[PDB]
Amino acid sequence: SGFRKMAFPSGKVEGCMVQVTCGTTTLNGLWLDDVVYCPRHVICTSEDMLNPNYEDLLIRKSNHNFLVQAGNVQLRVIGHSMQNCVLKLKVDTANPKTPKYKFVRIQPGQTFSVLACYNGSPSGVYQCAMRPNFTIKGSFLNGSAGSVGFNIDYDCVSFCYMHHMELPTGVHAGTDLEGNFYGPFVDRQTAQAAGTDTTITVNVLAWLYAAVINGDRWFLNRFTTTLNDFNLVAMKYNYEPLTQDHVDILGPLSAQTGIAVLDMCASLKELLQNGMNGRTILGSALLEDEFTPFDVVRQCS
């Protein structure tokens, strides 16, 4: 028992991480088979970051301009391309450590593990959700661009996120591995703001189920509510609407605990209307929304 924010083991991703340098600009790249993927703003100079014309910059570069370090081993670039906001740097040497992998784009409300790196060297691993407003609330300093987010299924690494940049509010923005940004953002050092965020209701309910599985029962009650009457309360507190498909996804957890989904919603309503009154749930005094139903089933089962 116990419930912690748990990342996937990061070994398979650590062996893919390289350093990429253009002149005095450096960041991380992802080395799979004979291609290194990295954020395209590695070709910007310090003063060309307010509105880079990435087509200029790339046509004026040559292969020998790209320094790729895989630890101590320098890697020879033998081809370069741009794909949306990432570069694909072809290299002569295929990565012997390439795991089986997929490029997937994730949905807001889904979680993934982040391997934060600096100068091609893994620094730490932690768990993130994609927020309804397409930002992530990560932990990233200068040098972290090119760090990737991922999920692991049996032996398959599904890469879903490459880090690019920090917004002024302190949250983070990036692309899928195909170079298309999550959310309405661009890779330029301009004023950009996220839309207003909401709370991921299905996740809060899943975390309430994790709590009940771990012995926290004080917020339970015997009232039930209807789906529409719960959504009226949700909208009032800036939670996203709950759908019938959310109720279905919660089925396994409703079955294991014997607490019907709409019964749990009555508890949630009460917590939103009343607060927690100095008690806690799974070591938190706020409602946590960064565990999916899958994440709960994964730990508690």
Partner: peptide, 8 residues
């Protein structure tokens, strides 16, 4: 005010 998070 966005900061691209390369280094140096």
């Amino acid at each position: 005010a966005v900061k691209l998070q390369n280094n140096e």
